[PDB]
Design a protein around this ligand. Sequence first.
Ligand SMILES: O[C@@H]1CNCCOC1
Length: 330
Amino acid sequence: STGSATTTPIDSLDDAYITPVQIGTPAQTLNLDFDTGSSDLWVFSSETTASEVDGQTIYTPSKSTTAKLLSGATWSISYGDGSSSSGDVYTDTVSVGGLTVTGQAVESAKKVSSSFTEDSTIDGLLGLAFSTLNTVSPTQQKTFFDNAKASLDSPVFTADLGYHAPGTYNFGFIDTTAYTGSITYTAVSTKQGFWEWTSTGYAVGSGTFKSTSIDGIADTGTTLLYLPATVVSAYWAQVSGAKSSSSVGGYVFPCSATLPSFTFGVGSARIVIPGDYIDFGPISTGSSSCFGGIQSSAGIGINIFGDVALKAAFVVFNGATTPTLGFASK
Ligand SMILES: O[C@@H]1CNCCOC1
């Protein structure tokens, strides 16, 4: 089997991408944030504290003939931005882009943090990291991808994120029309439960390539690119007036600047992030100071190849017994 679903930016800054997902019988369609950096599928629901729901579409298991309470199971998760949610668990039929999984754990939120409440466009998350990160207790649950994996033609999914434009998540096949050149595959470590890999280095603009190993994770659920302070300082040093601002919480630059590209290495291959991708616009409406798309990972503990990097590539998440990550230009 295979699935193919369009993913769409939630706003004009590509802060996140939402993908329609069908849950239950008859289908209830929710727009979920596909997140290769976590492993829970959770949704706003009829159980979510009313004051914490503001415009989201909710899952109502009582209206689904295939929903069953997973008795005694609870879940609680916190994300890298400090957001969080928790609740209980149903099993139900879940379909993405024509690909159907029965008995999927659908985690129903009883509580969500304000950042989720304030974002009316995201109805929940669909985790695509390894199931060892799933937070359901006392019986840990499998991701949509892990459940689907047996039925898939190939144990892969691909992320093809758009720049200010819709993109595609495919399951079970690699669309050879969706990229140019060849795909370069690189080893993945699952030891921390992430799609963790090692970049072979970087270049700033037309500068020479610096060969250096950078361990990081491929994370569709993170907006920006977070790299070691040495790397990020070398990048912003090439932008007149750029600086790190503690008040703003990262690198800012004059909106009048032209940003250089940023290249990262995948084995012997090179993925080039255009300068425009790194511009996240005025820090507040009307400001002449703009927020940078490349930021330091120093306060995080881990380097993160977020949307800023991933949208510059066609990315293959290979969930074979020996998992790998593939990157191609597009
Ligand atoms: O908000 C980000 C999304 N990715 C999962 C881990 O970090 C949290």
